[PDB]
Design a protein around this ligand. Sequence first.
Ligand SMILES: Nc1nc(Nc2ccc(S(N)(=O)=O)cc2)nn1C(=O)c1c(F)cccc1F
Ligand SMILES: O=C(O)c1cc(-c2cccc(Br)c2)nc2ccc(Cl)cc12
Length: 257
Amino acid sequence: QWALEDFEIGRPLGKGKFGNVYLAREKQSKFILALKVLFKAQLEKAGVEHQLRREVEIQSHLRHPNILRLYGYFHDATRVYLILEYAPLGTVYRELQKLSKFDEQRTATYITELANALSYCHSKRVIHRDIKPENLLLGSAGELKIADFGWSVHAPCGTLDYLPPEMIEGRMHDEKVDLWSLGVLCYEFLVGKPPFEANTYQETYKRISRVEFTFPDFVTEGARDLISRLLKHNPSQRPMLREVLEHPWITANSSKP
Ligand SMILES: Nc1nc(Nc2ccc(S(N)(=O)=O)cc2)nn1C(=O)c1c(F)cccc1F
Ligand SMILES: O=C(O)c1cc(-c2cccc(Br)c2)nc2ccc(Cl)cc12
């Protein structure tokens, strides 16, 4: 059904990893989209063809306005191509580099968008596991969209900043993992760096396992309450997504249609 000849390739949007993403237009429909181009070689060498086929199967059925659509896929002798939705405002990662942190309104909005997408996800027993600013895209109305579904499996790596303790220790993990990740995002959005950043993987491991973060002065009590509630070692004490969406700090600072 799909072949490279159906697309006009524009410029690069980002680089792999297993491969690069390019802006592209489908020739017939003039539909603008993004093409992830993974090389079969790396995929084979890192042994991820199995997880990719998983991710692709998971991603193609999901329909939510805060989740990035996969429209389709194809492959050539030397490449696998994924046909993704193009998010025209880029990564949250890069937006954060530009602003050196977000105000409460933007943060509370992003966390609402994210918790909604995660409610939808958990209600199909899909745990993301990789929520991080490099995987968060922004649509044309500046709305957050989760991308990069790889690294996620039906319930129950590089830098370890976004992982909860029960996952870096190799233990059992459920949906509560994504709640930890939100607390790490919420922190990084407000402060400009994640709460357990360190110069080495080995220090970050320690900081996560022992739950060692301090708030700078500009962080308000309502932000400190929700972050502290999300960053609990016992997955059981983390709140549900609904408690998060109804948190007084969120309700007071977020945005709603
Ligand atoms: N699907 C998708 N759309 C975008 N949009 C986008 C728009 C602008 C820029 S910028 N400011 O030029 O660097 C970058 C990306 N990225 N994208 C991806 O899959 C994607 C991703 F998830 C992470 C990194 C790179 C990507 F390419
Ligand atoms: O030659 C193939 O049949 C091959 C196909 C695919 C693939 C096909 C459809 C969807 C998706 Br998602 C991936 N992935 C590969 C990854 C590595 C290697 Cl060595 C080969 C493949």
